[PDB]
Design a protein around this nucleic acid. Structure first.
Lengths: 126, 126, 98, 116, 208, 82, 153, 100
RNA sequence: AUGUUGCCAGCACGUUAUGGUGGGGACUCGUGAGAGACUGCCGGGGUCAACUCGGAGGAAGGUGGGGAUGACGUCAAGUCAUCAUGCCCCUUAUGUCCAGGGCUUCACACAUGCUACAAUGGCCGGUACAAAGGGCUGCGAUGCCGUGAGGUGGAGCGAAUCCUUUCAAAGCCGGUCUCAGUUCGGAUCGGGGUCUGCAACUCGACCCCGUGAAGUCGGAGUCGCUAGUAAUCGCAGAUCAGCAACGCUGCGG
RNA sequence: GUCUGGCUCAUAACCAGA
């Protein structure tokens, strides 16, 4: 996977670390990734306890996956962003293994929104 | 004499009706030198057809504003109004045909932020 | 000889008030009028961005509307003239005498 | 018909056939046809030999086309290159020379896109 | 950006322009001298509550009418204040500039004066709840006032966190066009920054 | 290019400089600062130190570059590649 | 369409043929609002058909429509969280719309050097039952029949 | 914007009225007719000797009070930010919000 | 109600040049006031209630169409570079003046658009219909000179009057091209010019001659739009000496 | 098996053709 990182100000080595960490997420995505962008920003105010902000955006075959984190330095922000992206990709999977427990089962046991409605005759059963 | 007006989306038509032959005088030009489109001619002569008074009224018309289609529509409304003024008791026939209704369809105002009246700029999620 | 009296004001009621008061005074002096002939309203439109920074898609529109009335008299007797330069009008309305 | 070494198109109107000459576009062909006197709508298979001759000597007379034009353009470009002017090294490295933007566009001078 | 300025919403319906003149070639310099006049009057007079400043022009003579809650403060008994304002308005290249000092009939029913008083109280030492409550009660005590809303925001009480607070009494129909809402905004100067106070006062409606 | 009626444009400074330069037939390096001046046939031998933004680059005029500007021969931006 | 059906536009009868369907055809072939060119193309095609066959163009055009009009069409249906190709009966209006759209498109991909000749040839071959629109109707009917197992829902 | 730059704009205007009024305009009248002998006259060179600030081409319409160099309106001499605020307060005669 | 700079139906003068001209409120039109849609009425459902369906009348029928108007708050969303401002920092400088350069750099990536890939078309000739808006050291006409940008010249206009041509293009008619990387497409490049500006090298626009690239309808994926809408065609304005405007804001076919 | 069209979030499987 190819990632372009648009940092700002002073963050030496943040671009390379973010690139190498994010590029490892291609195998986790179950569909081809069309685009992947990362942005690193730092808060000017020293009063901020977590100044560094990292944002990511992945185009998973038309499905947009994004996350945003805060950290005290570039490495921690990148690692937390990787964790959040992994969780989002896990929740997006949508392949059969990810939607086999949600497909309605049985015949009369259990009901879901998309469950097949029961067929009813014209006359009351009696 | 009698004189009515017809208006159709910025086209204004003044009509002067006299009981002569079926000669069509549109700003000194005939129905063929003007309006060289058969559909426009049929749209013009429809009120005469439904009233069956074809070729018994010399028509003098003043045309300004809009294009050929708007001019034709406003002219048709003008002959409808002139006919309703000449022979009142035909109002059912013209009205149920819709020829007595001014068409309130005008160019929608262009809106800021949109390329056209409703067309919106292309938006990219990725 | 007739002279043109031209009114231009941003407020309709103001220019109508001035027009009626002017026809009143010229009729007092005994002059023939034409009436306050209306003229097309002039519209100047401007579009501005609401926010100081960015946010181009949000715009605000303004206009300035100018109303015009035309007064023409006849038989310019000197009494009507002396009355004409002795008229007090709202500052909003101006007069053009030609 | 072989015109200044150029095989004319088989069936074309005269001026547009003459457009195929490297030194002639549409205006040049029109004015030379009008001045010399041949019809402008007649097809290329209707030329007689003397018509070919009159076109030939007129064109060699008051026009410059084909190899001489190409070599003159090449020499002009080379001379512009060798004096070290801005257009010089612009020609040297295959980039647009008339101030066109190069951040995104200018693939015509850059050639086909390459991936690095 | 939530609410448009109430004066501008009803500029052509209920409220009136504060400047009355006509110019075609000299619109630009008229505007320049008008804003110069307004800013000069703003900085010069701050004790007396300056509620409104009108400017009228007709050729050479310029007529400026201003409304204050304390006319005696801005006017000199021997004309000393009048002399100063007249001279420094001649200095504004206004040619003949002539003034009508006026006084407002109900100071507590005017939004600008209410905001000025609330901000002045806020500046020195007063807690904002006291100021808002006092202004609201004083305003509703007046006969024509049908509803008042008072709001100021900023570092209230010298705190590190900006806050927005507001109280309302009665009816404040901001969306109703015929309703006349007197709107007043004025900024409170505090040692911790700037506090902006907004006042809406609703007094019936005008039908033309 | 500049219209023909106005004629070529040359700054007065280096104009008087080259007139006093060629009056005694000796051509030393002339330090200049008007990159907008056209080349005139009076420059054929003179060597110009035309400005660049940082320094002055020597420009030795020839017959070929007459009619251009001193600016085309002092390339401003420096690019070596990525 | 969440709150109910929308009203239909009552387009007018043609002046020089007096039929609803030729107006529907000109609106189908219309591009960019150039209505005059669309009517010229349609009228030229109808006159070419009249010249070739020797009879009224409206009757042969109607014959082409009935030859290419579909009756059974397949739509994807999601019942009980599963999607299949379900054959569905087609209303008369939709069948006419599909037939006209097929005719216009498949005429646009012909090779008769001009839209008028392409359209005339397509209508003639549909009238005789050899056009590509007739073929397309054959395949859509074949697909509807081949999925008859899913017709119960 | 910056006080120095607000001032320098005005200084250009007084320079323009002092010089561009006749000095930087008669030279243009000399150069216009090809019949006029411009080449020996050095009306080009004489007009180069004039200060650059004489030229109105160096002027910039800034906001009359704010100093804002962009989003300017020639009718009012005011920035888009200031026009919006004063029109809303009813300060510019005969100006109001639009609808049509 | 209203007649000028706007209409001209009936009257007269017109000379090709036309409301052009004397005249006239008749019809438009311009701009003031007012009427008109209120489930007002009828029939049916309805708790005899809200509400709903259909019909009559009407220009318009059920908040007629489109605008302006954006509740308490959210996202420490944006803006200390419109402005103001607490605190901190600079003050022989982080202030201030000037010339030159840069913001236009390019192995690439993303995004918004324009032009195309053609015959529902290209080119040539003739020919018909708009709205809105702008104009004083500005719009600038007739005429003359260029092939064309344009040059000379200045009529009349603070403008319902004059100029933007009398205003358009798509459209209609006629001729030609004959399915080709072409009479498509116009990039790039060579030469020659015009205009603005003190000055078009970096780095303007336009004009002429020549040059004639990719491009054969575009993968995964994705966007806008329900009616005068999408699609398509042209016109105008702000900024502005000039323009990078194919952008933005409007207008009509 | 191999090339499409249909279908699927895509490969799959199923359907229509060469």
């Amino acid at each position: 996977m190819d990632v372009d990182v648009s940092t700002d100000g002073e963050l030496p080595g943040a671009a390379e670390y973010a690139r190498e960490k994010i590029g490892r997420l291609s195998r986790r995505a179950h569909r081809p990734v069309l685009h992947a962008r990362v942005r690193l920003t730092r808060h000017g105010d020293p009063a901020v306890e977590r100044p560094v902000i990292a944002q990511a955006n992945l185009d998973v075959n038309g499905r947009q996956v994004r996350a945003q984190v805060e950290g005290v330095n570039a490495r921690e922000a990148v690692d937390r962003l990787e964790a959040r992206l992994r969780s989002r990709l896990e929740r997006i999977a949508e392949h059969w293994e990810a939607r086999r427990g949600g497909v309605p089962a049985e015949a009369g046991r259990e009901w879901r929104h998309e469950s097949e409605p029961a067929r009813r005759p014209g006359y009351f059963p009696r | 004499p009698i004189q009515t007006v017809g208006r159709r989306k910025e086209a204004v038509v003044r009509v002067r009706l006299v009981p002569g032959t079926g000669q069509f005088n549109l700003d000194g030009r005939t129905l063929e030198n003007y309006f060289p489109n058969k559909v426009h001619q049929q749209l013009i002569k429809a009120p005469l057809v439904t009233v069956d008074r074809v070729d018994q009224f010399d028509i003098y018309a003043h045309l300004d504003g809009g294009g050929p289609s708007g001019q034709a529509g406003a002219l048709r409304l003008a002959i409808a109004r002139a006919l309703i003024l000449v022979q009142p008791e035909d109002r059912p026939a013209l009205k149920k045909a819709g020829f007595l209704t001014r068409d309130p369809r005008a160019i929608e105002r262009k809106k800021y932020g949109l390329k056209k009246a409703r067309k919106a700029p292309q938006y990219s999620k990725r | 000889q007739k002279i043109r009296i031209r009114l231009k004001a941003y407020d309709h009621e103001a220019i109508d008030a001035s027009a009626r008061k002017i026809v009143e005074t010229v009729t007092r002096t005994g002059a023939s009028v034409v009436g306050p002939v209306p003229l097309p309203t002039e519209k100047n439109v401007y579009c501005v961005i609401r926010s100081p920074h960015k946010y181009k898609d949000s715009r605000e529109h303004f206009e300035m509307r100018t109303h015009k009335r035309l007064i023409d008299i006849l038989d310019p007797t000197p009494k009507t003239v002396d009355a004409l330069m002795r008229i007090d009008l709202p500052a909003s309305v101006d007069v053009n005498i030609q | 018909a072989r015109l200044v070494g150029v095989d004319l198109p088989r069936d074309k109107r005269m001026e547009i056939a003459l457009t195929y000459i490297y030194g002639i576009g549409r205006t040049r062909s029109n004015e030379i046809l009008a001045a010399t006197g041949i019809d402008k709508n007649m097809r290329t298979k209707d030329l007689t030999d003397d018509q070919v001759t009159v076109l030939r000597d007129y064109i060699e007379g008051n026009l410059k086309v084909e190899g001489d034009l190409r070599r003159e353009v090449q020499a002009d470009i080379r001379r512009k290159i060798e004096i070290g002017c801005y257009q010089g090294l612009r020609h040297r490295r295959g980039l647009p020379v008339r101030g066109q933007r190069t951040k995104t566009n200018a693939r015509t001078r850059k050639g086909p896109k390459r991936t690095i | 950006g939530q609410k448009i300025n109430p004066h501008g919403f009803r500029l052509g319906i209920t409220t009136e322009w504060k400047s009355r003149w006509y110019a075609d070639k000299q619109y630009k310099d008229y505007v320049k001298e008008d804003v110069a006049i307004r800013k000069l009057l703003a900085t010069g007079l701050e004790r007396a509550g300056i509620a409104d400043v009108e400017i009228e022009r007709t050729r050479d003579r310029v007529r400026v009418d201003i409304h204050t809650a304390r006319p005696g403060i801005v006017i000199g008994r021997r004309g000393t204040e009048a002399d100063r304002i007249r001279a420094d308005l001649e200095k504004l290249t206004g040619k003949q500039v002539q003034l009508n000092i006026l006084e407002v009939k109900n100071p507590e029913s005017q939004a600008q004066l209410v905001a000025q008083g609330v901000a002045e109280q806020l500046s020195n030492r007063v807690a904002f709840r006291r100021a808002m409550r006092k202004a609201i009660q004083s305003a509703m005590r007046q006969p024509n006032v049908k509803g008042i809303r008072v709001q100021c925001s900023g570092r209230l009480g010298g705190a590190e966190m900006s806050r927005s607070e507001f109280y309302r009494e009665g009816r404040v129909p901001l969306h109703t066009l015929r309703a006349d809402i007197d709107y007043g905004l004025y900024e409170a100067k505090t040692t911790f920054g700037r506090i902006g106070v907004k006042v809406w006062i609703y007094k019936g409606d005008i039908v033309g | 290019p500049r219209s023909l009626k106005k004629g070529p444009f040359v700054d007065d400074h280096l104009l008087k400089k080259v007139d006093v330069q060629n009056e005694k037939n000796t051509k030393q390096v002339i330090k200049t600062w008007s990159r907008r001046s056209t080349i005139i046939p009076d420059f054929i031998g003179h060597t110009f130190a035309v400005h660049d933004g940082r320094k002055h680059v020597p420009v030795f005029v020839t017959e070929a570059m007459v009619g251009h500007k001193l600016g085309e021969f002092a390339p401003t931006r420096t690019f070596k590649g990525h | 369409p969440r709150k109910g059906p929308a009203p239909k536009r009552p387009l007018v009868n043609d002046p020089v043929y007096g039929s609803q369907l030729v107006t529907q055809l000109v609106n189908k072939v219309l591009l960019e609002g150039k209505k005059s060119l669309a009517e010229r193309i349609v009228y030229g095609a109808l006159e070419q058909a009249r010249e070739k066959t020797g009879t009224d163009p409206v009757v042969t055009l109607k014959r082409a429509l009935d030859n290419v009009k579909p009756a059974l069409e397949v739509r994807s249906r999601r019942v009980g969280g599963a999607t299949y190709q379900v054959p569905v009966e087609v209303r008369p209006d939709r069948s006419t719309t599909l037939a006209l759209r097929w005719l216009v498109n498949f005429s646009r991909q012909r090779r008769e050097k001009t839209m008028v000749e392409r359209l005339a040839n397509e209508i003639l071959d549909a009238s005789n039952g050899l056009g590509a629109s007739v073929k397309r109707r054959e395949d859509t009917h074949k697909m509807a029949e081949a999925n008859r197992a899913f017709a119960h829902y | 914007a910056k006080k120095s730059k607000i001032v320098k704009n005005e200084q250009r205007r007084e320079l323009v009225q002092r010089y561009a009024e006749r000095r930087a305009e008669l030279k243009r009248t000399i150069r216009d007719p090809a019949s006029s002998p411009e080449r020996r006259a050095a009306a080009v060179s004489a007009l180069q000797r004039l200060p650059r600030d004489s030229s109105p081409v160096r002027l910039r319409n800034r906001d009359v009070v704010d100093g804002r160099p962009r989003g300017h309106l020639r009718k009012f001499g005011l920035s888009r930010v200031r026009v919006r605020e004063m029109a809303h307060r009813g300060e510019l005669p005969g100006v109001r919000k639009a609808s049509w």
